[PDB]
Amino acid sequence: ESANDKELDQLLNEHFAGRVVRKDLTKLIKEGANVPVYVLEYLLGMYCASDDPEIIEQGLRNVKTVLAENYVRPDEAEKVKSLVRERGSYKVIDRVTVKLNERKDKYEASFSNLGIKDAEISAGIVKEYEKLLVGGIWVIATLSYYFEEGQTSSPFGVSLLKPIQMPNMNMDELFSGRAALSTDQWRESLIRSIGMEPASLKEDVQWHLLARMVPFVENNYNVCELGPRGTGKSHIYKECSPNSILVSGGQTTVANLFYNMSSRRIGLVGLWDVVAFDQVAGISFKDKDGVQIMKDYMASGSFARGREQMEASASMVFVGNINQSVESLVKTSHLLAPFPEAMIDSAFFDRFHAYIPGWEIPKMRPEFFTNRYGLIVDYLAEFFREMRKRSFADSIEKYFKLGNNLNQRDVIAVRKTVSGLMKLLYPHGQFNKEDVRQCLEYALQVRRRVKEQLKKIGGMEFYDVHFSYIDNDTLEEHFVSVKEQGGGGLIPEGPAKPGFLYTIGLSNKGMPGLYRLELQVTKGSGKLATSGLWNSSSAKEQVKIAFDYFKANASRISGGSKVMEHDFHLHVVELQNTGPLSHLALPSLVAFASGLLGRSVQSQMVVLGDMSLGGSVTPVESIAECLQVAFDAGAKKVALPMSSAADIPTIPVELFTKFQTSFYADPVDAVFKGLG
Template sequence: MTDSNSNEATNDVLLDKLIKTLPGKFVRKDLTNRIKEGANVPTYVLEYLLGMYANSTDEAQIERGVENVKKTLANNYVRPDEAEKVKSKIRELGSYTVIDKLTVHLNEHADRYEALFSNLGIDGVPVDSRYPQDFERLLGGGIWSIVRLRYAYDENNKNESPFVVDSLTPIQVADLNMPEVYKARSEFTTDEWTDLILRTIGMEPTQFSKREKWLFLARLIPFVENNYNVVELGPRGTGKSHVYKELSPNSILVSGGQTTVANLFYNMGRRQVGLVGMWDIVAFDEVAGITFKDKDGVQIMKDYMASGSFARGKDEIQASAAMVFVGNINQSIDVVMRTSNLFEPFPEVMATDSAFLDRIHAYIPGWEIPKYKPSFFTKGYGLITDYFAEIMRELRKQSFSDAIDKYFKLGGQLNQRDTIAVRKTTSGMLKLLYPNGEYGKPEVQEALEFALELRRRVKEQLKKIGGMEFFDINFSYIDNETFEEHYVSVPEQGSNSLIPEGTEKPGQVYTVTYDKNERLSLFKIETQMIAGNGKFEKTGISGNHKASEAMDTAYKYLKANSKSVSSSISLTTHDYVVNAVNLNNSEMTSRLSLATYIALVSISMSKSTLDSLVILGEHTIGGSLVKLDNLADTLQVALDSGAKKILIPNTSAADLGSVPSELLGAFTVIFYDSIEDAAFKALGVK
């Protein structure tokens, strides 16, 4: 770090307040990056050591401390490629101190606890029973620790490990004075405290907008809220999994891949609670790869996410770990919103299970966080990471979820799960920003609107996946004083219109119907007409026989009845090419007759259909109209696609009573009672 950078950090107003309010509890964050390049250990391990040796603002003392940390890591941190050298040191010196990640298990055959050293690569090392009793997380996932190992080879017990744990000190802050934290918070403005949190997690706040800062804070809600379920999907390189791996010794990151009920929830053989009982957060990296060996794995996860408990055998097990799911979205968000849904990266067993997805309290829009670059990492001062982790852990013991009630009521479209989710997110944001509880109406309102957005994002996708069951997505809150109702939307919903505004070319029409997998989708028909002798070609249907039959039905009907529409239509002197495309996915449908018929009429008469129109219905070769299935869901897909006008057969008029008034009111509804009538009204011909 240059002198100029050092002066910038020293003159920072946050540093002045840190020196005054939390002496000895902060560290210069660029030191972590300097050392981390040479040691693959979590941030909280490095800052634990920096807190011991380099907790100062004096440049000379800092440099001496950094050298001490480097020396400690060089001498004691076990690199996997130097494991044999360290084992030799333990043998030759008789005992030696190492820094490594330990996992302890009970060897029931020998009736003792034994440790596995991750980097040192030794297993079966006897451990005094007081350590797993005092530090339960040793039994699941492991803890980074400073360990004094002794070498005691026994000629008579050659099968025993010669290594023995003499002392074990988990790398975590020993003392925490929350009143000191509350008092310190009152010395900072909200903006300053926000910036301090960002610097604590290693980010430079001057590089980000307020919106981006809040998205960073949202990643921390699982650290302060029990049983909080959150998803963040977005591009690579935005640090989605970083905080869950590096920020706290109280969270564990499970790399995407196969897991088991025993590992995650409860081991029936050992009668031992899994990761959810030992960690504050269980985060899943690369969600696309999550699989359970057990058939009931997803069901048990659903039960746990809903209630914080699960049944194994005769036991009902309670736990408080938050569940975090992070992964990548590789397409632009506009493409994803048009063609699929925001949960598509999940494995199919989860992505299609609306009951599982409904248990997610918040969806962080990872695509709004910019990809990391060097200037994003701070050179200023922040709290020691492990100290901040313990603050967040202490905040789990209180709840601010009732803060909403003093000022606001939640709107009528929020169900019980929505309400729980919004309260949890609001509580989490208030804890992070106002741990001392000193907040008022504007602060609650801001957190509430943010919480409503994160939950509505979940419901918007559930509406796409699960249909009318999740229709109520118009989230709002009501001011207790003015009774004014405020509605909250999600930013990306404005960009998903598949049907453009304005007039389409003649021969282009839209219809909503079921594809071959019985999924409602938006289909676009495009038609070309050239001089010829009556040839009719179909493209885009990928050899789908039923789709081809439906198009042929439309063409043959028009050929036989064209004069009832217009005498100018002459199918024998033109060739037609009709292309069909599913704008929501790649699957085709067999229900294209009416849309194809109107597209042929449109291009034959060189007349466009009405703006933003979706055509609903189907007909037979004899001219009979087919009644629509599931009108409410069909209209919802049309609305999501950008339709403003709907062409509906009179035979479906009776079904309009099943459509919510808000949905029906979004359209101009046009009824038709024959195939020809449908064509006239679609073209706006009286």
């Protein structure tokens, strides 16, 4: 693949000019070089001619010589001014920002290090390099000193000005270059440009790394990434981007972050494209409302502060370190456990457009640091800033429709993540159905993870976690799962928690399907709540009939427990995707009884049959297929109605031998058999 790497290299060089550099060489210079990384990369690229080892060493020495010659320390600032005054001219490497003084009608340059804030600069220079007027750029400048008695202008002037970072972007050339590369090659280049080696990483790791780069290209893209220490979470936001900030500690005051009423200056969010809170273990505010103002901002993208409502395009990223195992946190808690208590709220975490699963990222080891060609970090960041202005959210509706389990906020999050990934991988705008399918699958997964955490932390509101999408041509519905949860494993071995049971029923399509009934019992007034029923009216009537029978027969079952003093929520989970179920009165009643008494349903036990309001039990239709499903789903015990008894001979012998079979008579007997 090294030869393929060389064809990649020449595909770069054909279209990507010196804006491609060898990454390893930067690791040779960044030993304390005071200029930022992208400055070093640009200089090395513009002093790297033909990659001859002698030429590499020569250019490396030239870059080091220039840096050691023309740099000025802050405290030495006064010194350099004298050198300008004595010599009449002096070269300096510094970050210059240009402003227009309309009062004097001229261009005034300001240096970060030297502290000069009124250096006269000609209009031609600023016309050539417009970035000076935007945020200021690193530059090599030839300052000249000329003073006239009684003058008002600062005597310092700028004569020759050569940028040290890429000033202007030819986006069309990049479109042509990307068109010249395959998708795999382009993804490899993107992974390389941040200093990572695609050959040392699985494709899933590559997609997660691209998800890390999503916030740089999508507006108001809130995202949180939690992982084990040392997985390279905070590298990109702090070193490999000039328009992102890594707020260390998370402790920033409201007037700092959003808007200072006294000084009437916008906070961070109006200045940086990405604001990354480096830690989450300790975020606790001086002002109680900081969480609330973040909630509003991430909700709408605009906040009212003082006398005005102001917009902002900063994407907030939250980086977190986990000391526990993933399974421990999932089983004993919710994955948002490391976040501070004052931040643990459904209304807050609902706004996150993505939960990056950082733990699948391997802990970084010098193998993953690539030594091949890659785009300059400056060029990559200019790519990101340019792509923030465009949009690709409409690509989803062209080939797919979002399922019924996505409320409006999940829709927004999925569209944003898909648009971001499309911008990274297909900037030129040419894409197929498969590509959108892959991006949509990834987006649905990452949003679903937040949805599951919201479910566990918030209860009633977030049980619609069955994220799926509908094809526009075959109308086939594809479901997407998260690996920290299950998938298959239809009925696990061992005792289930009370209130959870499994049933098999005939769906709307007539094919037997497994369902799981989950009952949540809390203190209340006997109110019954429903979820997961596919909005089926007949199913809701069945639930009402079952709960009415439970209310009428509470004494005959519980022997003293009061249903009137506890509220129940029944959730239906479909594990085979056959369709909505109507025959559910008996399993729902068994779930009610199990939850009220707190008795675990027998392990691997399937409850069949249906019951009416009068307490009559009904035969199980297509009982042989239902029992075959139970065998397939992992059942070992079955409760069958005595009415289905005449249907026993139709069942194959080897199939029927697999059940510790129970035959109930009336719904209360079925409850007792289920409870053992």
